[PDB]
Paper text:
Viral entry is mediated by the HIV-1 envelope (Env) glycoprotein trimer, a type 1 fusion machine comprised of three gp120 subunits and three noncovalently linked gp41 subunits, which binds to cell-surface receptors and fuses viral and host cell membranes. We engineer crystallization chaperones to identify a crystal lattice suitable for determining high-resolution structures of inhibitors, spanning a range of >6000-fold neutralization potency, in complex with envelope trimers of clade A and B HIV-1 strains. We report here the engineering of a protein crystal composed of a highly glycosylated trimer and two crystallization chaperones, which were adapted antibody fragments.
We sought to examine whether the new lattice could provide experimental feedback on the recognition of Env trimers from different HIV-1 clades. To investigate the structural attributes responsible for this clade dependency, we first determined the compound-free Env-trimer structure of the B41 strain, a clade B virus with only 78% sequence identity to the clade A BG505. Surface differences were also present in the epitopes of the crystallization chaperones 35O22_3T2S and 3H109L_MM, but these modified antibodies were able to accommodate these changes, and crystals of the B41 SOSIP. Env trimer had unit cell dimensions similar to those of the BG505 SOSIP. This conclusion was further strengthened by the fact that B41 and BG505 showed conformational differences around the drug-binding pocket in their compound-free structures.
Residue numbers in the entry:
A (entry chain G): 129 to 135, 153 to 184, 189 to 309, 312 to 321, 321A, 322 to 354, 357 to 365, 369 to 396, ...
B (entry chain L): 6 to 67, 67A, 67B, 67C, 68 to 95, 95A, 95B, 95C, ...
C (entry chain H): 1 to 82, 82A, 82B, 82C, 83 to 100, 100A, 100B, 100C, ...
The structure:
Amino acid sequence: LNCNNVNEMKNCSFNVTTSIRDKIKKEYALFYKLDVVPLTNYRLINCNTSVITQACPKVSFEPIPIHYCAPAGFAILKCNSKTFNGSGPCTNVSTVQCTHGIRPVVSTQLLLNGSLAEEEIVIRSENITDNAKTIIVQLNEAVEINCTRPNNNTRKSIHIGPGRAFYATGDIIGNIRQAHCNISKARWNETLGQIVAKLEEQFPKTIIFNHSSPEIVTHSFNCGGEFFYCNTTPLFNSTWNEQNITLQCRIKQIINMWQGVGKAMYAPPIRGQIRCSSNITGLLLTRDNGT
Amino acid sequence: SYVRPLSVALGETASISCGRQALGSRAVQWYQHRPGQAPILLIYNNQDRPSGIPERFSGTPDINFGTRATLTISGVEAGDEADYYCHMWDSRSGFSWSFGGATRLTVLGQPKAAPSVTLFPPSSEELQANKATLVCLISDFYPGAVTVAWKADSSPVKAGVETTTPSKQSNNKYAASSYLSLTPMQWKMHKSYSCQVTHEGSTVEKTVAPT
Amino acid sequence: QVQLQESGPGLVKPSETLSLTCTVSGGSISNYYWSWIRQSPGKGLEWIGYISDSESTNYNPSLKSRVIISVDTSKNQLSLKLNSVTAADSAIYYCARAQQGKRIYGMVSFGEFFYYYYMDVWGKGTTVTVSSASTKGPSVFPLAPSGTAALGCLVKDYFPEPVTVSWNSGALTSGVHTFPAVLQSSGLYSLSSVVTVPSSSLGTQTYICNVNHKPSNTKVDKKVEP
Ligand SMILES: *[C@@H]1O[C@H](CO)[C@@H](O[C@@H]2O[C@H](CO)[C@@H](O[C@@H]3O[C@H](CO[C@H]4O[C@H](CO[C@H]5O[C@H](CO)[C@@H](O)[C@H](O)[C@@H]5O[C@H]5O[C@H](CO)[C@@H](O)[C@H](O)[C@@H]5O)[C@@H](O)[C@H](O[C@H]5O[C@H](CO)[C@@H](O)[C@H](O)[C@@H]5O)[C@@H]4O)[C@@H](O)[C@H](O[C@H]4O[C@H](CO)[C@@H](O)[C@H](O)[C@@H]4O[C@H]4O[C@H](CO)[C@@H](O)[C@H](O)[C@@H]4O[C@H]4O[C@H](CO)[C@@H](O)[C@H](O)[C@@H]4O)[C@@H]3O)[C@H](O)[C@H]2NC(C)=O)[C@H](O)[C@H]1NC(C)=O
Ligand SMILES: *[C@@H]1O[C@H](CO)[C@@H](O[C@@H]2O[C@H](CO)[C@@H](O[C@@H]3O[C@H](CO[C@H]4O[C@H](CO)[C@@H](O)[C@H](O)[C@@H]4O)[C@@H](O)[C@H](O)[C@@H]3O)[C@H](O)[C@H]2NC(C)=O)[C@H](O)[C@H]1NC(C)=O
Ligand SMILES: *[C@@H]1O[C@H](CO)[C@@H](O[C@@H]2O[C@H](CO)[C@@H](O)[C@H](O)[C@H]2NC(C)=O)[C@H](O)[C@H]1NC(C)=O
Ligand SMILES: *[C@@H]1O[C@H](CO)[C@@H](O)[C@H](O)[C@H]1NC(C)=O
Ligand SMILES: *[C@@H]1O[C@H](CO)[C@@H](O)[C@H](O)[C@H]1NC(C)=O
Ligand SMILES: *[C@@H]1O[C@H](CO)[C@@H](O)[C@H](O)[C@H]1NC(C)=O
Ligand SMILES: *[C@@H]1O[C@H](CO)[C@@H](O)[C@H](O)[C@H]1NC(C)=O
Ligand SMILES: *[C@@H]1O[C@H](CO)[C@@H](O)[C@H](O)[C@H]1NC(C)=O
Ligand SMILES: *[C@@H]1O[C@H](CO)[C@@H](O)[C@H](O)[C@H]1NC(C)=O
Ligand SMILES: *[C@@H]1O[C@H](CO)[C@@H](O)[C@H](O)[C@H]1NC(C)=O
Ligand SMILES: *[C@@H]1O[C@H](CO)[C@@H](O)[C@H](O)[C@H]1NC(C)=O
Ligand SMILES: *[C@@H]1O[C@H](CO)[C@@H](O)[C@H](O)[C@H]1NC(C)=O
């Protein structure tokens, strides 16, 4: 790839075999810096790792309410205890043929669109005194998050084979801007305070929030079809004894899904502007002197 | 910088489109530059005007992206004849060192006026200084385009005459000088000298004799 | 309010420092932006550069290693020093007050704005000519009249443009009509002024034209009478 800049995504050009096997065309396209690496000349980040398959531009990534049902002759047991921590005996049990409407939201660091809690917010764990055990916190009242990619992009169909049409990115109509998110500074202040309340019921001390120790370092989710990577440092930066909080999100088009056997996926670009509104109903923390 | 010609009629509405359309959010400046004169800031922000600019000078704002920048002059006068520049500042293109191209507005359908020829004989001090000069002065004619003919008695001259290209005036009419340099003996040896200024489709004559 | 007035040599030899100056009136020098603009015949307006209220330099890259826009705040004065001049540098040089606007379109914190500059008040303009030809003073010759009559003055063979013609040091200003000059093939300009006067004042309302040609340090006057 022969990649330019813009001002961030590169402007790359490359020779490609077309529908006819012996004729060459020189196409141009845009690729985010996270999708390319210098070899100036460039290439796609995966090529020394794995084959990549373009996601079909007609299948949706929409989290749909999925119900899990037990077979005939089996049973699922519920727990209506409104203060139930992860384990132990639940004194309010009910049997169900299927689970409730569960959305398979792929998220990181911040649980999105999930089920809230009743009464107060609860925190869970296995052995909370073991630091190498993740803490699953469930909120009772969601804090509104609003993310967007304001750049007005365009989709280009590149015929690189009989029927094989790779959808690329080309030209930003209008202003070049920054993909980001927004949550209420007050609502995240009162909710972080509620999370601080029960970090005392399990501990004594002072409660410090800091950034993580780009899939896992940042809040990574899916907004309208494109996978954001939102820097959550303006989120966890507090010590407890109008204003919007905005995160600077990057955008990837190639993701390594879950494993690393050797299969990656190319998310085709979404045309126009992107903006999605979600509910953060959970939080996945990790505790590490006197604090 | 090259010139873009534009023609409107007296009293109508002018529509000067910018020659460099914006790529992002824009902040366009419009300058009224009359040739060899101080430029006039018409519109600095996309549509904001300074103090002392008529309401008839309107600019297009960029509320929704896509609307190109145009200068709208309603009720055009004769004094609105000038150059017009589009200083384009947008978020994509860098720094706008260069002004716009040029849109020379020429108003059509103006009152046609005839010239006021005035010829002076050579001065006394310069005739003493061994040099003569006939000065045929032309003023207040429209459209500004005249051709000058000099006659020594009845014979054409064509030799030793300079002529000014018609420049504009404050009252929006035109003026042009015409100097015929003669030797002091040539000016005295001839009975009469004439100046024919044929403006549009008619000539006017102004003659002077050495007496 | 604020007005400006430039002042320059008017004639500079090739490969030399085209010095210049611009004094502003009724305004502080150190709280606005100031732009220099020239405009040659045949070409359009050209933005030389601009200095800030912070005295920061920023020139048109069109002019490579040449421009240097100074400023001295003891008075209301700021200069302009072009050097290594050539024939294409002949133009009218204007002095204008630039003002800064900040056009925000996205988020101010992310840097989604850009700075644009607009000039709101201009100077009158200083004509500058470049040529190896030396300066030249003129030589006026009166023009005597013939209900209404006309008389004037003939300003012959000067260099370079321009000259200023007043009548009775500034008193007679109605009917005055100074004409554009003529570049003779000899390389010298020639101008002609003329005033339409009531024929009753022909005898005798004294009439004198005041000719000033700055590149020659000359100030001459001449009477007109039949
Ligand atoms: C997620 O979180 C994010 C972070 O919290 C959050 O980000 C926010 O995003 C939004 C949208 O993306 C941003 O909104 C933009 O804001 C821009 C800035 O607006 C401010 O500044 C201007 C100008 O201020 C100067 O002028 C005023 C008077 O004119 C003075 O009083 C000021 O003091 C100031 O002058 C000094 O400062 C200058 C430096 O800037 C100096 O140069 C100067 O010399 C002086 O020293 C103000 O006018 C604005 O006031 C408005 O808001 C107040 C509330 O504060 C209200 O009372 C009222 O509604 C006011 O109108 C504000 O303070 C805007 O420029 C921008 O809007 C323009 O741009 C868009 C796109 O570019 C256009 O579509 C739009 O139409 C606007 O264009 C108009 O204006 C331009 C420039 O003036 C014109 O060229 C153009 O022709 C057009 O004019 C038309 O409309 C005008 C009215 O707007 C009208 O006057 C004209 O006559 C004509 O009709 C846009 O709104 C916001 O900034 C972000 N926040 C931050 C902190 O960055 C995000 O929203 C969150 N949510 C998400 C992402 O979902
Ligand atoms: C990413 O990089 C791409 C290059 O690899 C960019 O594409 C190029 O973009 C430039 C403008 O930035 C185009 O240049 C324009 O071309 C048009 C077309 O006119 C041509 O054809 C006529 C025949 O009618 C001919 O007479 C002209 O001389 C031109 O040759 C012109 O109208 C413009 O004035 C200007 O020259 C390139 O054509 C274009 N190349 C390709 C292969 O697309 C792309 O813009 C970059 N995008 C970003 C977001 O950075
Ligand atoms: C959380 O749920 C909301 C609502 O279902 C999602 O917003 C939808 O997003 C899709 C695609 O961007 C749109 O077609 C819908 O119209 C949106 N619905 C509403 C009500 O706005 C949101 O994307 C979800 N968030 C996550 C991270 O999955
Ligand atoms: C395509 O191949 C030609 C072969 O001559 C080469 O010159 C050109 O640089 C190639 N294009 C790119 C984008 O590398
Ligand atoms: C592939 O290349 C990248 C260069 O960014 C390198 O970090 C990575 O270790 C390489 N992987 C393999 C399997 O070679
Ligand atoms: C987010 O919370 C609001 C407030 O209850 C609700 O209206 C909306 O449906 C919720 N969205 C999702 C996806 O659960
Ligand atoms: C949940 O509650 C039971 C008793 O009700 C307790 O034994 C268990 O430790 C609790 N779980 C956590 C993670 O504290
Ligand atoms: C929890 O972990 C600590 C060490 O981190 C260990 O000493 C303790 O026995 C563990 N408790 C349980 C119930 O696993
Ligand atoms: C995005 O660009 C397209 C043209 O490519 C245009 O039709 C559309 O209105 C633009 N949308 C916005 C929100 O600017
Ligand atoms: C998020 O967006 C919704 C709808 O646009 C709005 O009601 C809410 O106030 C926004 N919240 C934040 C924190 O931006
Ligand atoms: C997140 O933002 C902070 C400042 O807001 C910055 O110092 C940090 O480097 C950012 N994180 C990453 C991974 O770049
Ligand atoms: C906060 O964000 C919402 C939507 O994201 C927006 O409507 C609101 O104006 C923003 N407020 C501030 C102060 O930026």
